[PDB]
Each structure stands twice: as structure tokens, then as C-alpha cells.
Symmetry: D2
Subunit: 216 residues, 4 copies
Amino acid sequence: ASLPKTHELHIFGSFNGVKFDMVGEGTGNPNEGSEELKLKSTNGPLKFSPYILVPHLFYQYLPFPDGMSPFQAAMHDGSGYQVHRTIQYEDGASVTAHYRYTYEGSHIKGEFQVIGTGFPPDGPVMTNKLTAMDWSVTKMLYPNDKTILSTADCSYTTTAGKRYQSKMRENNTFAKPMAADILQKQPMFVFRKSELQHSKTELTFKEWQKAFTDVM
Amino acid sequence: SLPKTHELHIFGSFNGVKFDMVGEGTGNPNEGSEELKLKSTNGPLKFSPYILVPHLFYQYLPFPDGMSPFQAAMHDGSGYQVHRTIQYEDGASVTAHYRYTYEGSHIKGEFQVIGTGFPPDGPVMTNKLTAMDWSVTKMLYPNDKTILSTADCSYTTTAGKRYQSKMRENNTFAKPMAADILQKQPMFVFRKSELQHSKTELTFKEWQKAFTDVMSGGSHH
Amino acid sequence: ASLPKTHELHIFGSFNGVKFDMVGEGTGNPNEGSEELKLKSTNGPLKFSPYILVPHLFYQYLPFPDGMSPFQAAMHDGSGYQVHRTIQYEDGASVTAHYRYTYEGSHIKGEFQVIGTGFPPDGPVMTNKLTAMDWSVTKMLYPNDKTILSTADCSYTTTAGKRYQSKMRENNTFAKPMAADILQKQPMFVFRKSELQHSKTELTFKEWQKAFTDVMS
Amino acid sequence: SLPKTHELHIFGSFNGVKFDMVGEGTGNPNEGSEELKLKSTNGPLKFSPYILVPHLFYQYLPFPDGMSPFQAAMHDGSGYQVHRTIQYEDGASVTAHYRYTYEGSHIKGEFQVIGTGFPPDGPVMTNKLTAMDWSVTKMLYPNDKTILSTADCSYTTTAGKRYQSKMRENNTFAKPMAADILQKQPMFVFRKSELQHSKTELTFKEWQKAFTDVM
């Protein structure tokens, strides 16, 4: 029974029908909601903006303001959760994703499937015009004691100085009920910052996340 | 000047039935707080008064480092307009248009609010809404005269189930926003609201706070 | 107690916070769902693509396969309906509209408020690059006996060859319940074709509409 | 070749719980008709079988003047992939990915379907759906290898209230679509479906008709 210290990821799928596959590993601090990840392609250069991957690059590192997050609680007792995520982009592209995890003590192993379609060949993803993912606020609600619905209006900056917007929605489905200290505090917001460096084949990702019910 | 007092005429219809109210209130533009009391001019409201909350004054919202663009546009008299849509989970929709005139530190609002498709057995027409959940709005500036604001909103209900909606608006400015405002995006706003009501009268309070970050600088120690 | 033959329109509102106002008159045929309208601006050149007005340019002209549409039925008995429409455009613009009607025999008077915002100044609406409204299919459902919910995915062709897409949603709210034989046939689809010619100050509009529950029978 | 027969392996999960079905069918690619029989490989389904309807073969769809792009992509073997999202009014969502391979006039489908957020007391998890309403899909071709299709879908339910969803998908082709396809936009498709189910199998039929016009 542990909170995480290290993780590894196998992420795979396709963009516009062309497969991709990466593997890597990282660390984080589950008291602080910080994480680091290094990935490498197993199949040559990426054929799309690496910034498209940012949401897909570990809420087990997210504490809540007064104790473990439900994500942490489900790792700590092994019962776990699954993530089912949809992203609709303003130019008509769509991404669906499914995150599965296994745990070995303080080590997480993720297997993530990400499928993207409808990215215009001349758009900012396929022509590498994204420059950074804006800071975000996610809203979480708990429609039942095993399900979190999370929503965020997301945006990237681009080289043309126009933002590239999307709507992100997801269910987090838990094998066991969430705790009562969790379920009674709604809505729960989470502020996130991300940083990405990249080459054609390798990515270096960091995330900082903080849960909040109030800013006043 | 910055505002101290305001009044509102809010009118339109819900499910094709007209409504009309007039109200007066006050606010603190340094702190993002406001209060408003209204009375119906046409008898008891036939829908949950909670449905009116977002429609019951960003001139009271300061920004983190100075006047909000809303405040600046009142201060120089150029002004802005609000065009908002709300789509509810049970298929209802509300559209709203907010116009303002100013007389020194006094705001006068004229708001048209039109709602349709509220199920006769749903929580709006059966008065099951109990409170508006605290919210975070995201703002972006697609061009120098236009703010796009989005929020995922929810009410608690007597059934213990939330009643969710998607709120979207454009704020259209007659003159460009200041360059220093446009340079910091996204801007978020956290809001809290309280409503007391009868069939014909209501008391509204709101607290709003703009923020770009919730994390510490990290240079303590 | 009549079905329509003639109509007039006052349409007004704003686009990107700038007012507009138009008036005109037309005719149509309630047997076949055809209509024609001519409009003129009362305040000089329109500052936006006149194609953006198309959906706002008369379902009283729409018959149903075997009898009156609910729209026809509500004009015929004077009880009436109101329209509340939202249109969300792919580039983040939004239009809301409210249609109200009064009737004098076979003549309809429309007063339409249309408010649009968030059109990018460099986009196809504000730079007049829309070239045609694609033919459309609207889906109608009747969630209660006085309310129609209609939805359509709409698109314009543009001078750049890429389509300019939107999502159109409306409620039509009736003073009296719709007839049982209307309510029993759902969903009800409507196929529409439109044609527009325009200048900076004037336009001529035509629509053809046809209701259908099936294309296989 | 145009298809005569098909088989399906459909798998994934609903509210975190795995399902897996296999089955086979036939169809008429000149008329746009198909039928399929399916069985669970691991026990009775824990959700309304009607939720599977969209996931239960556009190779059987002709176009008004010739092959659909789907048919043409089978005929030359180059193929297409489907990536579909469905957002339901009560907050549930389904994502799906369909892959196909071929031998002669036979199609083999491999479909991954993942559904989450279905309320435990809702019409899917308590089996209150009664039928899929007839639908109209709008198709556009943003580029010569990509179809975007949209539909506003609804089921009837035991109590009369429709259960509504928004269906969106991309169909991604390995080779350009034919220029005579690409010229006719939008292309609409009317569909009808029929589902019967036991505890031991389901039987599915679909009829589909492409049109540019009804007038």
C-alpha cells in the first residue's frame, strides 16, 4: 500500500489513421501534485505536434486539500480507477483516450490508448504550430460514488498567435466507492500547468496540479 | 467613475410566458461584491427564481492588477455589451442580452432573458433548484474588442442530483481593451452567489474574484 | 381563419455589436412549402455577409405529408407559436434569434430579433466569403404537446472551398397543444433548400421545404 | 468484390465492466440491408442491448449513382477506419473504433466500444430503451481521405421520453475517395434498425439509404 514515487508509460494509438507508439518513465511528488516524464518513440519521429499529447502524458500524484485524492486512495488500496476521455477540437478534430494502470508498491505502470482523427493536414497539429498548452481549470463532479465527471475548456498557443481551443470531458470510473471526505466536497476544481520540451522522437514533460474548492 | 450603485430592469419569457422585474442594489468594485433586491411587476414568477442567478454586473469585478476591462469601459464611457447562451442538460436553453447605461457611479442595466424547452416536470418549472454551485469561468480574448467566456455551471436540487448547464458568452467592447490586459491570458473568475426568494421578490448577492493562478510563487523559505 | 399567401418582415438586431435593420415583403405557397422574400436595409450597407441571415429569412408555408404542419394549424386557429433559436458557429461565433408573428387573414407579419457576436473580423462572415447555404435536414421532436425541439447541422460553402459549419437548435413554443396525429409521427425531418441574391443594401431570398418521416417507403 | 457476408467481434467495457460478443451476418449491398446474429462470449450483458445498435457495416451501403466510398474501399481492398463518439443527454459517453479486413465477399469487423458515465438508475443500465429512432446522418468530406458524419440520435423508452445523443465520427480512408463521390455534398443517409434479444443471443437488422435530395 503506497502513494506513488515513480511511473512508467506505454502510450499508443493513431492520429489520422497512422499509428504511433512511445514508452518512458518518470517520477513525481504526491504531496505536491508534481510529475516529470521522459518518453521515446518506438516507431520513428512523431508525425504530429507533440503538444497534442500533453493531456495524455497521472492523478495518483494529485493530493486533495485535506488528504488523499480519490485517485490516490484507489492506488493506495489497489482497487484502482480507469479514465475515459474525449477531446473535441475547434477545427473538427477529435481524440478519444483510455487510461489503464497497474501498481507495484510506489510504482505505477500506465497503458494508454489515444486515437485522434480529423486533424486537418494544414492545421496547427499536423503542421507543428502549437507552442504551449495554456494553464487550465478542470471542474469535477461526482454523479455517483464510483464516477467522476471532469470538464475543462482547453487551449494551446500557436505560432500564428491565435489560440487552438478544445473541449475536454472524461469519466473516471472507480472499482470501489470513493470515500465520504471526497464525495461531499463538490464541485472540486483542479488548476494545472504543463511544460514540454521535445525532439522529433523524445519528449520531456512536466505537470503541476493543485486541487481547490475556493480561491477567496 | 467606478460603480457604487446599480438598478436593473430584467424582462423576457420562460416557456413563452412573459416575466418582468425591477430591482436596485449596491456593490464594491474594489472587492467584487454586489447585492440586489428585485420585485416582479407582473405577479408571481412561474419558474424557479434560481434560474435567474447569472442574469442578476462585471463593473463590480476588479482584475488582479487593476481595473477589469469591464470597469475600464464603464470608466471611459465606451462600454460593452453581453450576449450569453445557456444550454441545460435536459434540453432547455436560455439566451440573454445585457445592455448598460451609466450616470456617474450609477449603473442601469436592461437585460432581455428568453428561456425555452424547460420540461414542465423538470427542476426549473417545479422549483426544485436549491442553490447555484460556486463556479469558475474561463476568459480568452480572441480579438482586442471581444471576450469569450465559458463556464460549466451546476445547481443543487432537492433530489440530491445536480442540474448542469454550459454557459457561453461574448462581451463586445466598443473600443479595444488595453494592451496590458490582452497580454495576460487565460483569465479565470471564481464566483459565489446567494439567493433568497419568494414568488414575487428576491434578494441576490454575488462575490467574484479574478485569478490567473492558484499556485504560490515558491520563493518562500 | 386562413393559411398564408403573403408575408412581411421586420428583422433587426446586431452583429458584433453593430446594429442592423431590414424590412420587406414576400409571398409563398402553403401547399408546396415554397416562399420568396425581398428585403432592404433601412440603415445603409450591411457590414456582414448577407448569407448569415438565411435561416432568419416562415414555417406557416410548410405542409405535412397528409395535412397541416403544427405551424400551419396554429396560424389557422390564431393560437400561434413562438421561435427561440440558437446557432453556434465553428469559429466561436454565436447567433440567437427570437421570431414572433401576427396574422391578418392570409398575411403574416414577422418581427425577428437576431443578435450575433464573436464573428472574427477576418472570418468568412465579416469578410463576405460565404457563397451558398448547403441543403439541410432538420430533425424535429416533440418533448411535450406544446413544444418542438428542432436540431440541424448546417454549413455554408465559402470562396476558400472549405465549409463554414454551425449547429442550429430551436424550440418552437405553442399556445395550444399540437394535434394527436402530429404528435404520433416522430421524428419528423424537414429537407430545405435556399437561394439568396444580394447587394450591400438589398436581397432576394427563396426557400423550399419538405417534411418527411421516411425515404424508404 | 462487394460484400455478401460479415462477422463481428465487438469488445470493450460499459461503466468499467468488460463485454465481448461474436457473431455473423449477411447483407445486400445493392439495397443497403444487413442482418446479424450475436452472442456474448462471457455471460448476459449487464446493460440495455439497444445501446449497441450503432456498433452493430457501410460496405452494404450503395450510393444513388454507384458504390459508396465505403464499398469502393472494400472493392479495391484499401479500406477505411471509423472513429466515433457518442455523447448522451444524461452525461454518458461512448467511444468506438472500427477496423475491417476482407476475404472475397466476406467482411471481418473488429470493433472496440467503450462506454462510461451511464447512471446506474438510467435507461441503459435498467433496460428501459425500447427502440432506436430512425435517423438521418449528414456526411461532409473535409479532405479527400476523410468523411465527417453527424447525427442527432434518439431511442424511445418505456415511459415515452426519448433518450437523446449526439453521434459524431470520422471515417479515414487509406486512398482518396472517387472524385464523383467528393462532388456531391452534403450526402445524407437515412437509417432504420431492428433489434431483438434473448438472454442467449441478439438479432439485428439495418436498412440504410443515401440521398442528396428528397424533393
